[PDB]
Design a protein around this nucleic acid. Structure first.
Ligand code: 0KX
Ligand code: MG
Ligand code: MG
Length: 347
DNA sequence: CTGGGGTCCTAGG
DNA sequence: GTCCTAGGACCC
């Protein structure tokens, strides 16, 4: 009788996984990134525990910066296979509730629920938090609404370890005075372009004439931003499996490369690694992109389409190296990367 | 000093 | 109304 979308987001996800094996660290600053050595150059924070975030540490910070901003933190190496495994357990549990479940990356999911009168979406969200914790030792937060975008926005108010409802009744009261980048997919550059037209809040955006937004942003985007400002969004939760569009690997080197021999050999090794992973997942490559970053932090990406979709190793390597060859490589190289775009024709 | 992994969209020769 | 790459803008 009442249709709800619940958005589950795991709490301090990488840190919470680490905390399962180190329960003595609960309540203490913990910082996941690199190899656990905070003096290591060219490594950053992947996840800071809530306690560490109070010192201003946050994902993407250099570990040496972080250690200097939270000297008593315990530094743990990033363990991806453990986060992957913990994700799968989380999705596998959420699926068994008998509601449509749309997974998004490792640590989020949307759930669609049509509730009779006797129930209450808040109490469905508490049994989600309870089932997850009991079975997996992970805490999560749950935002509630009638569309995905607004539920996801609610989840930021539910953090940490909580539940929050955001609907047409409180959308204006709660987020009207907030800047437009409180909305999903509006960031700093859209914000700046909005500020230029005199729009500095959600409520201001919500009442903007459509043709100002359609002229500035396109006839479908401009209306979408209106919709977002008014608290609307996607209402369908599809259980259909996500098909990745690409896969990539990049490596920042412990010291910058100057031998071209080594740059080639690294791109060749990244192309081979990425290809074997997509072939294992049953995929076919369509385009091949190479990324190069110098010691300047000068970074560019070039891409080329295969004549036809293929999985051929010798062809994809030659293509990547060919694309590599289109860069002037007269500066030391800090990073190299390869990305393989993938066919989405027939699964 | 400044990681690694993604998506979606528009500008444009 | 083509088929292509570049790259901006976000996000986890
Ligand atoms: N720049 C970033 C952002 C997130 N991540 C990883 C680490 C996070 O634990 C994971 C989930 O992203 P997230 O949900 O934005 N933050 P997280 O779960 O750590 O904390 P809260 O959701 O409770 O705020 O993606 C990363 O590797 N690099
Ligand atoms: Mg999270
Ligand atoms: Mg998340």
């Amino acid at each position: 009788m009442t249709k709800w979308v619940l958005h589950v987001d795991l709490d301090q996800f990488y840190a919470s996984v680490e905390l399962r094996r180190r329960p003595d660290l609960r309540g203490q600053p913990v910082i996941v990134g690199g190899s656990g050595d905070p003096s290591e150059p060219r490594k950053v924070v992947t996840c800071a525990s809530y306690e560490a975030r109070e010192f201003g540490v946050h994902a993407g910070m250099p570990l040496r910066a972080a250690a200097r901003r939270c000297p008593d933190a315990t530094f743990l190496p990033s363990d991806p296979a453990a986060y992957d495994e913990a994700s799968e357990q989380v999705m596998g549990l959420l699926r068994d509730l008998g509601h449509p479940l749309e997974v998004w990356g490792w640590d989020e999911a949307y759930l669609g629920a049509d509730l009779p009168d006797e129930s209450d979406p808040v109490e469905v969200a508490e049994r989600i938090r309870t089932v997850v914790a009991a079975e997996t030792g992970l805490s999560c937060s749950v935002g509630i609404s009638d569309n995905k975008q607004r539920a996801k926005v609610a989840t930021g108010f539910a953090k940490p370890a909580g539940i929050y409802v955001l609907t047409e009744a409180n959308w204006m009261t709660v987020m009207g005075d907030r800047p437009p980048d409180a909305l999903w997919g509006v960031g700093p550059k859209t914000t700046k372009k909005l500020a230029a037209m005199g729009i500095t809040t959600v409520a201001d955006l919500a009442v903007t004439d459509p043709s100002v937004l359609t002229t500035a942003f396109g006839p479908s985007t401009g209306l979408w931003l209106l919709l977002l400002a008014k608290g609307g969004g996607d209402t369908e939760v599809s259980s259909e499996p996500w098909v990745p569009r690409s896969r990539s690997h990049v490596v920042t080197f412990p010291q910058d490369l100057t031998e071209r021999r080594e740059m080639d050999s690294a791109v060749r090794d990244l192309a081979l690694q990425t290809l074997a992973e997509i072939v294992e997942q049953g995929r076919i490559v369509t385009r091949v992109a190479v990324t190069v970053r110098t010691s300047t932090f000068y970074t560019r990406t070039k891409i080329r389409k295969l004549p036809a979709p293929s999985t051929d190793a010798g062809q994809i390597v030659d293509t990547a190296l060919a694309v590599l060859d289109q860069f002037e490589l007269d500066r030391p190289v800090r990073l190299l990367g390869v990305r393989l775009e993938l066919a989405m024709d027939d699964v």
